[PDB]
Amino acid sequence: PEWYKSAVFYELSVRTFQDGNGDGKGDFPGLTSRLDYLKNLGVDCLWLLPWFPSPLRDDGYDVADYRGIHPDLGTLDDFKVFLREAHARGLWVIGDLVTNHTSSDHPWFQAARRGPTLPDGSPNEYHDYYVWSDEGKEYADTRIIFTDTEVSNWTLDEQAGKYYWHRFFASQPDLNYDNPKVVEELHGAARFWLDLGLDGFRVDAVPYLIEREGTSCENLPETHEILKGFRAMVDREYPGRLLLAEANQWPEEVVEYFGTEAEPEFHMCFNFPVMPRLYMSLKREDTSSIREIMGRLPKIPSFGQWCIFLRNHDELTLDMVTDDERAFMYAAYAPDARMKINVGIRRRLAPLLDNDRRRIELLNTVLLALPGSPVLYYGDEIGMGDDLGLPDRNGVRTPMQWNAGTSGGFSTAQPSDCFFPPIQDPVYGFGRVNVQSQLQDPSSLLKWTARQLELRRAHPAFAHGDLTFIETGNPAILAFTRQYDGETLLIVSNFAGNAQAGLLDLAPFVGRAPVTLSGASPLPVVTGNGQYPVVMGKYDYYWLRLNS
Amino acid sequence: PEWYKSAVFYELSVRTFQDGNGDGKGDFPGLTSRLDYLKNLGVDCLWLLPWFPSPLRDDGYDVADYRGIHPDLGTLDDFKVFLREAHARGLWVIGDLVTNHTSSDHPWFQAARRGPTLPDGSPNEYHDYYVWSDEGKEYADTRIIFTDTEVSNWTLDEQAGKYYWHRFFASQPDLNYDNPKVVEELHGAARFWLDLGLDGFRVDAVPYLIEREGTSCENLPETHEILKGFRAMVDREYPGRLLLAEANQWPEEVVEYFGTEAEPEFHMCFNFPVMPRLYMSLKREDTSSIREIMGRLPKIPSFGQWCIFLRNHDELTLDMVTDDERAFMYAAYAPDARMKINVGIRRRLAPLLDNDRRRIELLNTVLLALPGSPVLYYGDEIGMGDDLGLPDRNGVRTPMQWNAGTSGGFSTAQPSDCFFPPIQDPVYGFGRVNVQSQLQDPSSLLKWTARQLELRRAHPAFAHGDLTFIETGNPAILAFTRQYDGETLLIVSNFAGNAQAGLLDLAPFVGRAPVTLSGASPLPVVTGNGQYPVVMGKYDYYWLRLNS
């Protein structure tokens, strides 16, 4: 099969991971020094947030040059050396392709706002790069994404005298993708990095490329064709690279981003519909939500794989849940209004689970045992908390915490001088939550996370198995099998805080023994009617095999 | 009933708990300022390690003045104030009475050593306070406890000219209890503290009082009878106080230290025979050692109550298990030679369990659910580690870890100036492990423990119930009931690192509905012949009730 199908992914931000020269910013040499770490954890492919020159208004998703390295993070040599030293270790690396928009400080915009007519009278070929309107009345009936900041998806440019369009911050003018010169500048931006050896892109904000009037301007088939043309160029020019979509849309609409067998689009997408069901089901001791939204997912192509995640650099998004669902989410996971942002909760994973490692472990095992390829957000694998005194979503992006030295060992500059303050609260601060500690601690979240990844590696059904939900008698208990190449897994997991009892329907499996995936320990043989009786301690996970 | 039967005991050392005067040593002023900690923890009775004047060759168990407060710890007034504030919050306090032996520096033995005849030719009355020998040949066939230090239980005195006897350190000469003056001196020491309001006494080395030729000089009748008389005086003169006995022997002999109902000895003794079976049976993943040793223990008198304990200030003793059992514990729990001292392992509860909170929690609940009154060891409730760079058994008597301020909050002194050094390693040090942090962490081991005690509070069957073991068919799984005043509690614990199944023998309970003590989640009604199927995750504890 495909390398992205069997790979464990790991999301990190170069500016925040490790600083080698001591200027308080994470740099590519620093990150290179830490690849030994990531490889021993069980990681297969690093995914790097945008590393491109940028004013960092949206932390570098406001790209100001797709073809250089941001000075903060070192040089192109620094980048080149990093990607080598990662490939010599068997890590794949992918980047972030900011395709929907560019910064207002891009040299494209800085020209487009001059007017459709240059001084001499010629047409300014760059004004057509971004979308403009004279009154700003167009594409209404359209949803605003960063409502806490932005009143209007249009903004007036004091020098272009028109309104430009932006699905996110005012400083990120949307790119006119009706202009086939823009599909080529983008095809070029991707080519430049694939030419350097890069193993793929996560493509950011794909639903929002094209905007048609009388529609929502999300998931337009005009948009999907542009993507198709991208996978076209990647499939022809650079075989085997990985295109990963971030599509947070309803079950049906998201699978459209895989394209079809005939007409490929993305290799994997983020399973954004399950992640909130994971959380909201944990507080309800009801696994029904998980099972519903999973049924609603249409089969994806052969080449496609899902990408399971718990958290990321962004808020816990809550805009593809029902109105009762999102209100529940706020009441169980956002007690402080400071924790709300743009329809979502902006908290790290451990703080979301009240630092309960029984819970942190349980969600992480679901994340491994669901069909897809898991992605761990950096720091979560050692239990990092957040800092909601920081603006926007930066609260979950504080510096990695390697030890209890100066600035958690992320930099030799004082914590006041690191790009984001290294957490030092008495519960999640780096005096308590740091990699050094957890490699000496025989039973740390870090040793646990790595050992679990080792277990999953030992069972390809986790990567390539099918998914069959097994009835239990108990909504707090979520059971499913995974079959692939003869081996059948049975993943039973308690989503409740105290002992739960359950009656599993292993009727298909009468005669077979469940044995633990670790310890090689057999339970009783499935017998008679196959109603398998089971008790579960709080927040437990049973990883089992069914032999023959 | 009597108060000790419902008490939660908490063992601490005044020299190492809280320094209230900057000098690097804990003191009674300091300890007094932390009593609201203990009250709020759910602690009933404080057992204070020896507070008496001492050269501290054996941490103060080598007493030099049974009637003072060691200057390191403050003054008799500071003691009376502590004892008044402790009682004010409903805490009981018991001291440590060191009957078997005094310090070399004690006035008595300093007088004894002058010889039988004083320079004026009259008898020296203080010579017979201690046991002397002209050649050291007597009481052969005796064992040495401090095997790593003392090569014989006789030591020649350079002045006295003869050999004096000592079951422990040669700077701890044994007192001579065939001398009636000595038995009175002991009662006078007891009266002095009972009179101050002390609620009772843990008694040291009770089995080693009387030595007789041809015997082990252990558990001798002549000893027990001196112990009956001690109880006799306390029941007559100071009704209600507590005599608690440190009798680490085999099950038959341990229970003799309660006396009979006609002839009472101690109110409670430590359950030494069960302690090492728990650790052993966690490693072996087989709990038949527990059921076995626990079952060789005879019924004990009405007034009698066991004191269950996981660790203490001493080493984990292995002088009371088989040679084979003792080798397994070394290979299981002492990989570095440094961890062995004197037929035992000198490690803290968390290191012993490789800092796994699941296994800490399992053994903690089995301490709270076995029949007896449980005693905690200070710091084991936050996960404090050990410091085996310290001589003897001081590596587990490091300062309390209060905050991550100076020296763990134990002292405003620098750590290099405190009596034992506050632990600072990456895993167990006070930047990661301390009380203030665990008060703000929602799921800290400190809170976990408070709650588990608070939960045991609501179910007297723990404190007072009988104990009925229930067969399981999986030696991994331990199962037993507690029955008291109608409530039938079913406790089932998994001592294996993976999922385990079992067939509990709930025949005596058919028609009863097991629900969980916490939240009352129900498990199937016991039907049929009462062979209840159960499954368990690793290190799982089900605390259930069965109604009617």
Ligand SMILES: OCC1=C[C@H](N[C@H]2C[C@H](CO)[C@@H](O)[C@H](O)[C@H]2O)[C@H](O)[C@@H](O)[C@@H]1O
């Ligand atoms: O509505 C779906 C989402 C996409 C958005 N995520 C991308 C949008 C932006 C591209 O400029 C960027 O701020 C964000 O980091 C990207 O991951 C949004 O900010 C999230 O809150 C949300 O989960």
Ligand SMILES: OCC1=C[C@H](N[C@H]2C[C@H](CO)[C@@H](O)[C@H](O)[C@H]2O)[C@H](O)[C@@H](O)[C@@H]1O
């Ligand atoms: O075998 C029983 C024991 C009794 C002994 N405990 C008392 C002996 C000493 C009395 O002076 C003292 O060192 C120890 O703290 C007391 O609790 C011994 O030191 C222990 O290691 C051992 O477990």
Ligand SMILES: [Ca+2]
């Ligand atoms: Ca657009």
Ligand SMILES: [Ca+2]
């Ligand atoms: Ca003696």
Ligand SMILES: [Mg+2]
């Ligand atoms: Mg830098």
Ligand SMILES: [Mg+2]
């Ligand atoms: Mg002091």
